[PDB]
Amino acid sequence: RTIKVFTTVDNINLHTQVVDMSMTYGQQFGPTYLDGADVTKIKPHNSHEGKTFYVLPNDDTLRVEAFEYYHTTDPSFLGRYMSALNHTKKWKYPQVNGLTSIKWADNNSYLATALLTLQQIELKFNPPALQDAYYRARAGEAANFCALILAYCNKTVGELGDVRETMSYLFQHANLDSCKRVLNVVCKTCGQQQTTLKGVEAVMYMGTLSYEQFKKGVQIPCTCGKQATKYLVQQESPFVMMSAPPAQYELKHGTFTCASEYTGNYQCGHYKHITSKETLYCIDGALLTKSSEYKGPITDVFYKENSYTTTIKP
Ligand SMILES: [Ca+2]
Ligand SMILES: [Zn+2]
């Protein structure tokens, strides 16, 4: 028996195939997937006629196609992305206040808060798989985007996650080289140290939530033994992510783009997303509340930026 099916590694370039129906998909193709479901232990059915299957890049041509779409060499990427897709395709992606969210499942609260932020900051991905699925996620079809995020972060479904850490991985696949940050560490004895950062390191900071206070200056204990002052000199970026360990923080309307709230501790933590619109909106998975004032345990705050110049003399 024979049916005709298609094989692909990017869902773009399809390949016509003849399949012996007395064998399994793994026997003729190797590890094979149909929209996430592993069908390696499965033999062709008549219902599969004309359907498209993911495989692993066995030949070079599939490897050439796979690198262009995903920008990775990691041959495990397809199985991990397919394994993630098999779950994320079943998640619910409601529109909450005009943004694509995720109904909570499999400890995806950090994914929901990240996805919500990605929709409110200016950003473009370099791998086509990411940018294609990023576009579809903004349209409401976020299953493939979320599965790709897990594959690029080497995370699995159900595993707990950090939003700041998740952005870190994704910023490596965006085009942020144009971003530039300059910092002056002024230490009363060590001196006035300057650093220039390019790329992902130029938009992220771990220490405080306030961007104006980051412009004014923050003390950091120096490697000598005393205290040292830390402030921003030049910021050239579309946005800035300011992170701090979860602590009670007052979110003031119109002073930020969006923020990450983290309540709980250890294995009992949970993320909520706060965004600034005409008033303050709290998106918690598929749930939505609104208020004029907000105070909570914030761990990330995003701000808009273009070009900043400090008023501090070197
Ligand atoms: Ca929308
Ligand atoms: Zn010092």
From Swiss-Prot:
Changing residue 90 to N: In strain: Beta/B.1.351. A zinc finger (C4-type) spans 187-224. It is a multi-pass membrane protein. Inhibited in vitro by GRL-0617. The active site is at 109 (for pl-pro activity), 270 (for pl-pro activity), 284 (for pl-pro activity). Residues 1-55 form the Ubiquitin-like domain. Responsible for the cleavages located at the N-terminus of the replicase polyprotein. Participates together with nsp4 in the assembly of virally-induced cytoplasmic double-membrane vesicles necessary for viral replication. Antagonizes innate immune induction of type I interferon by blocking the phosphorylation, dimerization and subsequent nuclear translocation of host IRF3. Also prevents host NF-kappa-B signaling. In addition, PL-PRO possesses a deubiquitinating/deISGylating activity and processes both 'Lys-48'- and 'Lys-63'-linked polyubiquitin chains from cellular substrates. This is Papain-like protease nsp3. It comes from Severe acute respiratory syndrome coronavirus 2 (2019-nCoV). The chain holds residues 1566 to 1879 of 4405 of the full protein.
